[PDB]
Amino acid sequence: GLSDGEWQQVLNVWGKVEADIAGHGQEVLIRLFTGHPETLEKFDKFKHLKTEAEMKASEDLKKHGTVVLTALGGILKKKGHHEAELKPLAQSHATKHKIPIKYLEFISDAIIHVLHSKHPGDFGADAQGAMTKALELFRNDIAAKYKELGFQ
Ligand code: HEM
């Protein structure tokens, strides 16, 4: 649960991402894959990437980065009222993609890391706090749907 002040911070930070959604998306996925190589194995269409240079050079990775952050942004702009938007993602990721909730924790922290890296000194303590809470909320609501489905 976030206050409106906190949501304001979230959407303020998100403005940074929207100025370059493909660059942000790309770096988020790269941070995930290199930080946690087991995550790469969940992607049939990225599993061929061995090196970060191949990752960086991959237009399809940047494309998927755009898809992921576009979806996350749509969810964030709902300010918590995201049941309709979130349920199909929860379903596809539990039943089709088989993504454990741990990997959602991974990509959450990766987003935090990328924002600091691309906006050093421009991502303040209050902004980090708000973003972290938003991603926890996202993750927690997914987790509820995972439990429903009996998925680990
Ligand atoms: C902020 C977190 C995430 C968002 C917003 C997100 C969103 C999406 C969307 C919109 C799609 C395409 C439609 C669909 O299949 O439902 C997708 C596909 C997919 N996602 Fe996620 N996702 C997230 C996290 C993750 C993580 C952490 C993993 C694995 C470590 C993952 C693995 C996959 C895979 C394997 C596909 C299908 C890729 C393909 O073959 O095209 N996702 N995701």
User: Does 1-152 carry CATH code 1.10.490.10?
Assistant: yes
Q: Which residues contact 152 (CB under 8 A, 6 or more apart)?
A: 100, 146
Element (H, E) at 100: none
| Structure determination technique employed | X-ray
The DSSP call for residue 37 is G
Give the experimental resolution in Å: 1.8
Q: Which two tokens stand for residue 134?
A: 């938003």
Q: Among candidates 42, 25, 7, 22, which has minimal Cα distance to 127? A: 7
Neighbours of 4 (CB within 10 A): 8
* Ligand 1 mean position, distance from CA 68 (Å): 6
C-alpha span between 125 and 111 (Å, rounded): 15
| Pocket-forming residues, ligand 1, beta carbon under 6 Å | 39, 42-45, 67-68, 71-72, 89, 92-93, 97, 99, 103-104, 107
> Residues at the annotated binding site for nitrite?
64
Distance CA 137, CA 125 (A): 18
Q: Within 13 Å of residue 54, how many CA atoms lie on the same side as its CB?
A: 9
Residue 133 CA neighbour count, 13 Å, CB half: 19
Protein residue with least CA distance to atom 1, ligand 1: 72
Cα 99 to averaged position of ligand 1 atoms, centre (Å): 8
